[PDB]
Design a protein around this motif. Structure first.
Motif, PDB file in Angstrom:
ATOM      1  N   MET A   1      -6.202   8.572  -9.291  1.00 37.70           N
ATOM      2  CA  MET A   1      -5.658   9.703  -8.438  1.00 37.70           C
ATOM      3  C   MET A   1      -4.274   9.337  -7.854  1.00 37.70           C
ATOM      4  N   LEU A   2      -3.701  10.048  -6.824  1.00 39.75           N
ATOM      5  CA  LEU A   2      -2.649   9.580  -6.216  1.00 39.75           C
ATOM      6  C   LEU A   2      -2.798   8.535  -5.175  1.00 39.75           C
ATOM      7  N   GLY A   3      -1.854   7.556  -4.963  1.00 39.13           N
ATOM      8  CA  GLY A   3      -1.993   6.484  -4.220  1.00 39.13           C
ATOM      9  C   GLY A   3      -2.553   5.345  -4.916  1.00 39.13           C
ATOM     10  N   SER A   4      -3.260   5.442  -6.001  1.00 40.77           N
ATOM     11  CA  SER A   4      -3.744   4.584  -6.591  1.00 40.77           C
ATOM     12  C   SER A   4      -2.735   3.744  -6.866  1.00 40.77           C
ATOM     13  N   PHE A   5      -3.350   2.446  -7.170  1.00 44.34           N
ATOM     14  CA  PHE A   5      -2.333   0.998  -7.000  1.00 44.34           C
ATOM     15  C   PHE A   5      -2.938  -0.030  -7.793  1.00 44.34           C
ATOM     16  N   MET A   6      -1.913  -1.004  -7.675  1.00 45.95           N
ATOM     17  CA  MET A   6      -1.827  -2.037  -8.649  1.00 45.95           C
ATOM     18  C   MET A   6      -1.171  -3.031  -7.951  1.00 45.95           C
ATOM     19  N   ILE A   7      -1.282  -4.480  -8.376  1.00 46.37           N
ATOM     20  CA  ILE A   7      -0.333  -5.562  -8.042  1.00 46.37           C
ATOM     21  C   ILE A   7      -0.498  -6.442  -9.230  1.00 46.37           C
TER      22      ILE A   7
ATOM     23  N   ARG B   1      10.344  -5.444   7.416  1.00 46.32           N
ATOM     24  CA  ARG B   1       9.879  -4.923   8.606  1.00 46.32           C
ATOM     25  C   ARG B   1       8.341  -5.505   8.896  1.00 46.32           C
ATOM     26  N   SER B   2       7.716  -5.600   7.621  1.00 47.13           N
ATOM     27  CA  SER B   2       6.398  -6.140   7.688  1.00 47.13           C
ATOM     28  C   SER B   2       6.195  -7.116   6.636  1.00 47.13           C
ATOM     29  N   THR B   3       5.938  -8.287   7.399  1.00 46.26           N
ATOM     30  CA  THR B   3       5.635  -9.643   6.580  1.00 46.26           C
ATOM     31  C   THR B   3       4.288  -9.754   6.783  1.00 46.26           C
ATOM     32  N   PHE B   4       3.551 -10.361   5.679  1.00 52.71           N
ATOM     33  CA  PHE B   4       2.174 -10.554   5.682  1.00 52.71           C
ATOM     34  C   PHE B   4       1.950 -12.066   5.096  1.00 52.71           C
ATOM     35  N   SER B   5       0.959 -12.964   5.508  1.00 54.99           N
ATOM     36  CA  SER B   5       0.845 -14.144   4.956  1.00 54.99           C
ATOM     37  C   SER B   5      -0.153 -14.034   3.763  1.00 54.99           C
ATOM     38  N   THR B   6      -0.580 -12.945   3.260  1.00 60.62           N
ATOM     39  CA  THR B   6      -1.554 -12.698   2.110  1.00 60.62           C
ATOM     40  C   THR B   6      -1.179 -11.366   1.473  1.00 60.62           C
ATOM     41  N   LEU B   7      -1.666 -11.173   0.289  1.00 59.91           N
ATOM     42  CA  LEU B   7      -1.505  -9.941  -0.526  1.00 59.91           C
ATOM     43  C   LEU B   7      -2.791  -9.030   0.149  1.00 59.91           C
ATOM     44  N   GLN B   8      -3.767  -9.287   0.184  1.00 57.17           N
ATOM     45  CA  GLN B   8      -4.827  -8.337   0.626  1.00 57.17           C
ATOM     46  C   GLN B   8      -4.358  -7.721   1.904  1.00 57.17           C
ATOM     47  N   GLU B   9      -3.891  -8.826   2.755  1.00 52.98           N
ATOM     48  CA  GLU B   9      -3.189  -8.434   4.076  1.00 52.98           C
ATOM     49  C   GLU B   9      -2.243  -7.406   3.908  1.00 52.98           C
ATOM     50  N   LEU B  10      -1.241  -7.544   2.619  1.00 52.78           N
ATOM     51  CA  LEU B  10      -0.250  -6.432   2.357  1.00 52.78           C
ATOM     52  C   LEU B  10      -1.240  -5.187   1.966  1.00 52.78           C
ATOM     53  N   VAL B  11      -1.877  -5.254   1.132  1.00 49.89           N
ATOM     54  CA  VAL B  11      -2.606  -3.953   0.307  1.00 49.89           C
ATOM     55  C   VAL B  11      -3.168  -3.250   1.603  1.00 49.89           C
ATOM     56  N   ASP B  12      -3.788  -4.138   2.675  1.00 52.22           N
ATOM     57  CA  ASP B  12      -4.416  -3.411   3.624  1.00 52.22           C
ATOM     58  C   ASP B  12      -3.658  -2.638   4.648  1.00 52.22           C
ATOM     59  N   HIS B  13      -2.250  -3.280   4.672  1.00 51.29           N
ATOM     60  CA  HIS B  13      -1.433  -2.653   5.481  1.00 51.29           C
ATOM     61  C   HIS B  13      -1.078  -1.184   4.970  1.00 51.29           C
TER      62      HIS B  13
ATOM     63  N   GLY C   1      -1.423   3.333   6.008  1.00 55.11           N
ATOM     64  CA  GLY C   1      -0.316   4.189   6.051  1.00 55.11           C
ATOM     65  C   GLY C   1       0.962   3.884   5.107  1.00 55.11           C
ATOM     66  N   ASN C   2       1.539   4.968   4.561  1.00 57.05           N
ATOM     67  CA  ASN C   2       2.695   4.394   3.513  1.00 57.05           C
ATOM     68  C   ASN C   2       3.641   3.396   4.130  1.00 57.05           C
ATOM     69  N   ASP C   3       4.143   3.648   5.368  1.00 55.98           N
ATOM     70  CA  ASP C   3       5.252   2.810   5.971  1.00 55.98           C
ATOM     71  C   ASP C   3       6.579   2.689   5.157  1.00 55.98           C
ATOM     72  N   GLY C   4       6.907   3.571   4.418  1.00 57.18           N
ATOM     73  CA  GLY C   4       8.221   3.561   3.700  1.00 57.18           C
ATOM     74  C   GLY C   4       7.680   3.847   2.105  1.00 57.18           C
ATOM     75  N   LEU C   5       6.787   3.249   1.600  1.00 55.04           N
ATOM     76  CA  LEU C   5       6.143   3.459   0.322  1.00 55.04           C
ATOM     77  C   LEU C   5       5.881   5.061   0.245  1.00 55.04           C
ATOM     78  N   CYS C   6       5.875   5.550  -0.828  1.00 53.22           N
ATOM     79  CA  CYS C   6       5.671   6.809  -1.516  1.00 53.22           C
ATOM     80  C   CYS C   6       4.488   7.427  -0.741  1.00 53.22           C
ATOM     81  N   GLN C   7       3.471   6.792  -1.232  1.00 55.58           N
ATOM     82  CA  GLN C   7       2.037   7.209  -0.444  1.00 55.58           C
ATOM     83  C   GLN C   7       1.477   6.140   0.159  1.00 55.58           C
ATOM     84  N   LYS C   8       0.599   6.189   1.123  1.00 55.24           N
ATOM     85  CA  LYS C   8      -0.439   5.291   1.844  1.00 55.24           C
ATOM     86  C   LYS C   8      -1.252   5.112   0.604  1.00 55.24           C
TER      87      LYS C   8
END
Length: 163
Positions: A85-91, A134-146, A150-157
């Motif tokens: 769907m939309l917002g679907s994502f990956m790292i 503007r948003s620093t995280f100590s981990t990727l999950q932490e990131l993903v969970d940010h 909400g999007n916070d700059g990114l195209c979609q949350k």
């Protein structure tokens, strides 16, 4: 330590050569040239193996959002592929900088329809991660969970990991 996963099955013949099943995991101990000596994570037993039948893990691959060794454009074919769907994502491993990652997100523009957007997650000399300074995280999950709040700059949350 080095954790490998078997790519194929291995019918051993010799006393100290460890067989295994495809998918089986194994701690690599020594290394006798091209034969890796491992300790199977099921049997618990030790024997020599064909390095080229197995592949390191890194996991990270414990995560439904990490797609290992995936090219930028394959990553797009993934999310755009049905099921998503939309917002679907990956790292993923940034092939453009080993050890460093990128986030690909499924977007949308009415002038063209379903899109994919890529974001360069930079790392700090201090070890954390950020996409915008503007948003620093100590981990990727932490990131993903940010960006899933909400999007916070990114195209979609963000919504849910690529299928």
């Amino acid at each position: 330590d080095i954790i490998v996963v078997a790519l194929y099955d291995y019918e051993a013949i010799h006393h100290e050569d460890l067989s295994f099943q495809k998918g089986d995991q194994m701690v690599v101990l020594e290394e006798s040239g091209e034969w890796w000596k491992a300790r199977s994570l099921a049997t618990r037993k030790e024997g020599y193996i064909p390095s080229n039948y197995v592949a390191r893990v890194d996991s990270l691959e414990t995560e439904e959002w990490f797609f290992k060794g995936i090219s930028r454009k394959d990553a797009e074919r993934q999310l755009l592929a049905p099921g998503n769907m939309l917002g679907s994502f990956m790292i993923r491993d940034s092939e453009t900088t080993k050890g460093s990652y990128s986030l690909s997100v499924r977007d949308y523009d009415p002038r063209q329809g379903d899109t994919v957007k890529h974001y360069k997650i930079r790392t700090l000399d201090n070890g954390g991660f950020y996409i915008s300074p503007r948003s620093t995280f100590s981990t990727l999950q932490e990131l993903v969970d940010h960006y899933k709040k909400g999007n916070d700059g990114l195209c979609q949350k963000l919504s849910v990991p690529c299928m």
